[PDB]
């Protein structure tokens, strides 16, 4: 009798394949045929933030577009003023193998974690003037790969245990678990509503999650290797994944199909990070060949290069207001580009 | 306000100068083969932080990259090992480590443990590795087997090095192990420098 469910699966899969082939009228390359080309982009390094001792795994801006937090596996969480290149804070982390770090939309807290399977929440604006540890979210069984604040009290996190978790910070409680991936979740990305979020894993697929119902709503496949980076498009109706197969791919949420692929024969390295511009027509991808390529996310033509790092570009970040781009790297520097 | 900013910056920069002088006086090791257990030891007033990454789920190809700039990876193996072929698993792992883009300059300290358990076993190795019958040493039985495994690892190792990294195999006493890691890290640093000056 076990064949009944195999037949249900076989049938359902066929229906989904057919309903995804039928709603494919044209290719983005086509309706995108008569638009202008970006015009080759030439950004210059405007700032070099120095002070980190070892490779910079992560960074995140903060909703003022001036301050930024960076995480270095020397064991430091450095909060920099970007306008004056001044260090506002330097937090010694309890564990040095940090892989992610987040800046709260309110400015009061930062978060970081890594191979310790904990998300530490540090307070920035206290009565005794010195930043202290405020909370420690425990429960994951694999390294923290990404964390993001929903607000002062809630935080989402992705782990190398194939699971995402939504926490309440006051009670230090894992209020929701998100399961379904079969490989390490390497990146998460909140939608501008903070009601959904996509995650990308080492099973070569991305999943969309409702934050309140705790249910996977869509799965996306089409890469050939691990998805290392994922970034929501400015409007939330699509997202972009970057992979070890040396490609980026743009997926749509209302079509459930891969819309676009960004790749060149010259490029045979992996994509480490991605991020959109403020309008979303430029796609910035950091690579393992020490460079950052700027893709025309609508024409899929490589629009430019940022080539000022001596080691692996590890983290991208665009300001909330779109003024500057931040690149961290394994050369232990941050570069601010315009 | 900019005056206060410069004040805080100068204070932080003093602190960071101290931190920088502490960070280079310590050497980081990766032990291989809750999320991460740290160990700290001191030999001859040189400080070492070893890191055991037990606490992950057996798929290493992403978090291994965290250790691209350690002084060494200490790779422990059991020459002794419904019986799987575990020595071949260790060889395949060593080979994927040796040839990874981000660990190519990392010297590996190979520890071959349970040698006495092996010697107990060898009086079931010719089935796997059928070349063991023609192997010649460069209780002879135990020594031949042990050095055969060592030479398997060294054959993987001496193929794609290019001089940038080496293997330092030993047969394994926390005392002598600590001393051996000390000496091998000294040799790794010396070789990196001697290769910088085109002497090696």
């Amino acid at each position, epitope marked *: 009798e076990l064949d009944q469910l195999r037949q249900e699966a076989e049938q359902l899969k066929n229906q989904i394949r057919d309903a995804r082939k039928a709603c494919a009228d044209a290719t983005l390359s086509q309706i995108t045929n008569n638009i202008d080309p970006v015009g080759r982009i030439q950004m210059r390094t405007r700032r070099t933030l120095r002070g980190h001792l070892a490779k910079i795994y992560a960074m995140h801006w903060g909703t003022d577009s001036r301050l930024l937090v960076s995480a270095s596996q020397d064991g430091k969480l450095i909060i920099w003023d970007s306008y004056t290149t001044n260090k506002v804070h330097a937090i010694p982390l309890r564990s040095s193998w940090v892989m992610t770090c987040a800046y709260a939309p309110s400015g009061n807290y930062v978060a970081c974690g890594g191979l310790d399977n904990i998300c530490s929440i540090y307070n920035l604006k206290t009565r005794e003037g010195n930043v202290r540890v405020s909370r420690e979210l425990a429960g994951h069984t694999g390294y923290l790969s990404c964390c993001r604040f929903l607000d002062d009290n809630q935080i989402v996190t992705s782990s190398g245990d194939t699971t995402c978790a939504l926490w309440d910070i006051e009670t230090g409680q894992q209020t929701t678990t998100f399961t379904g991936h079969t*490989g390490d979740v390497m990146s998460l990305s909140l939608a501008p509503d903070t009601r959904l979020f996509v995650s990308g894993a080492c099973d070569a697929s991305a999943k969309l999650w409702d934050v309140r119902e705790g249910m996977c709503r869509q799965t996306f496949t089409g890469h050939e290797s691990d998805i290392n980076a994922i970034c929501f498009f400015p409007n939330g109706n699509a997202f972009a994944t970057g992979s070890d197969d040396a490609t980026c791919r743009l997926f749509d949420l209302r079509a459930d199909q891969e819309l676009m692929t960004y790749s060149h024969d010259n490029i045979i390295c992996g994509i480490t990070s991605v991020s959109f511009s403020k309008s979303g027509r430029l796609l910035l991808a950091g690579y393992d060949d020490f460079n950052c390529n700027v893709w025309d996310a609508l024409k899929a033509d490589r629009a430019g290069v940022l080539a000022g790092h001596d080691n692996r570009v590890s983290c991208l970040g665009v300001t909330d207001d779109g003024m500057a781009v931040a690149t961290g790297s394994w050369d232990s520097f941050l570069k601010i580009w315009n | 306000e900019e005056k206060g900013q410069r004040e805080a910056n100068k204070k932080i920069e003093k602190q960071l100068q101290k931190d920088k002088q502490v960070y280079r006086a310590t050497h980081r090791l990766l032990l291989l083969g809750s999320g991460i257990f740290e160990t700290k030891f001191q030999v001859d007033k040189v400080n070492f932080h070893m890191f055991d990454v037990g606490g992950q789920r057996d798929e290493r190809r992403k978090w291994i990259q965290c250790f691209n700039d350690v002084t060494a990876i200490i790779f422990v193996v059991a020459s002794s090992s419904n019986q799987t*072929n575990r020595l071949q698993e260790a060889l395949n792992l060593f080979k994927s480590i040796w040839n990874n883009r981000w660990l190519r300059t990392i010297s590996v300290i190979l520890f071959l443990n349970k040698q006495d358990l092996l010697a107990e076993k060898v009086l079931k190795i010719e089935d796997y590795f059928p070349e063991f019958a023609r192997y010649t040493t460069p209780d002879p039985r135990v020594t031949r087997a042990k050095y055969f495994i060592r030479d398997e690892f060294l054959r993987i190792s001496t193929a794609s090095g290019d001089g940038r990294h080496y293997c330092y195999p030993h047969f394994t006493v926390d005392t002598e192990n600590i001393r051996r890691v000390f000496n091998d890290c000294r040799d790794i640093i010396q070789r990196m420098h001697l290769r910088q000056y085109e002497l090696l």
Partner: nanobody, 130 residues
Framework: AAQVQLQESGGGLVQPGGSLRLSCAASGFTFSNYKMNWVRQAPGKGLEWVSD????????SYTGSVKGRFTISRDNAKNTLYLQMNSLKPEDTAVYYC?????????????????????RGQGTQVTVSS
């Protein structure tokens, strides 16, 4: 959309000493940029790496127990992987998966025996007995 599929076939019963040819069809990736593996799992055992072949088809590696007996081959034209098995022994009875290496253009192959690896196939059965 597309997906990474590795479909084994050609497995069945066979007498001790017989011969079979396992055929793994591949889809979802450029078959040539990747190194390929044969892994197996017997009753009550972990996963075992059996054989590997490289992007071109020249570099070849075997586990010791199937050397002289098994022959891995690749066909980039027809995207196929083959394992020829002759002089079979009963201790080969098992499920046989064709695995891929995670990343293309690489010489290292991490995590092909992990019990959860994503780029493996569902396997084919081989039963050597009376």
């Amino acid at each position: 959309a597309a997906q990474v599929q590795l479909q084994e076939s050609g497995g069945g019963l066979v007498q001790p000493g017989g011969s079979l040819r396992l055929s793994c069809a591949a889809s979802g990736f450029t078959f040539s940029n990747y190194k390929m593996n044969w892994v197996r799992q017997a009753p009550g055992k972990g996963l075992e790496w059996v054989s590997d072949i490289s992007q071109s088809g020249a570099s070849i590696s075997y586990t010791g127990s199937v050397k002289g007996r098994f022959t891995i081959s690749r066909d980039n034209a027809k995207n196929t992987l083959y394992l020829q098995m002759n002089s079979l022994k009963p201790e080969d009875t098992a499920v046989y998966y064709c695995a891929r290496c995670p990343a293309p253009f690489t010489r290292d192959c991490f995590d092909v025996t992990s019990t959860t690896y994503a780029y493996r196939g569902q396997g084919t059965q081989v039963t050597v007995s009376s």
